[PDB]
Design a binder for this molecule. Structure first.
Ligand SMILES: [Fe+2]
Ligand SMILES: [Fe+2]
Length: 171
């Protein structure tokens, strides 16, 4: 009943999957159908959306440097993930995970969401900090439900107009 297999060497697994840590996919899950969602995140990859995870996220930056853009107490903040850093993110802290370096690798551990507990993705306005857009989605469906929601927000400027000012968010 060792459902997830035997122990194996992690640096070698990361070496073997380094081509998946590059653009365009930029990440690779370790075990399937587990309660703990164990992912290695690579680079270069940049994103303007903020994740609203209903549960905690654990980070261990194994290779290279990266950083999280955070929405903390109404303001934008930057949390560095230098090589060797660990970090535990409380639920619902909006975060945008930036990875400027090729060859970087970050261990990210999350929990499977119970059904009905949805993930949020949001965009904020650079000028007034107001929320511009939010989409919601069940984690188990993201590979095949999120890009069209992103694309729809990205392919058109009405959704990008901040309701408090009018600045069209980028694309
Ligand atoms: Fe996240
Ligand atoms: Fe604004």
């Amino acid at each position: 009943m060792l459902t997830y297999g035997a122990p194996f060497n992690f640096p070698r697994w990361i070496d073997e999957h380094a081509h998946l840590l590059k653009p365009p996919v930029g990440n690779r899950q370790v075990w399937q159908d587990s309660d703990f969602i164990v992912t290695v995140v690579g680079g270069p990859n940049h994103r303007t959306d903020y994740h609203d995870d209903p549960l905690e996220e654990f980070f261990y930056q194994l290779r290279g440097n990266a950083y999280l853009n955070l929405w903390v107490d109404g303001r934008r903040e930057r949390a560095d993930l230098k090589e060797g850093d660990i970090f535990l993110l409380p639920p619902h802290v909006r975060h945008s995970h930036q990875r400027p370096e090729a060859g970087s690798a970050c261990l990210v551990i999350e929990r499977q969401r119970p059904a009905g507990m949805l993930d949020g993705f949001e965009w904020y306005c650079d000028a007034c900090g107001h929320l511009v857009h939010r989409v919601e989605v069940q984690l188990k469906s993201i590979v095949t439900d999120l890009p069209p929601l992103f694309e729809s927000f990205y392919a058109s400027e009405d959704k990008r107009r901040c309701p408090h000012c009018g600045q069209v968010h980028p694309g």
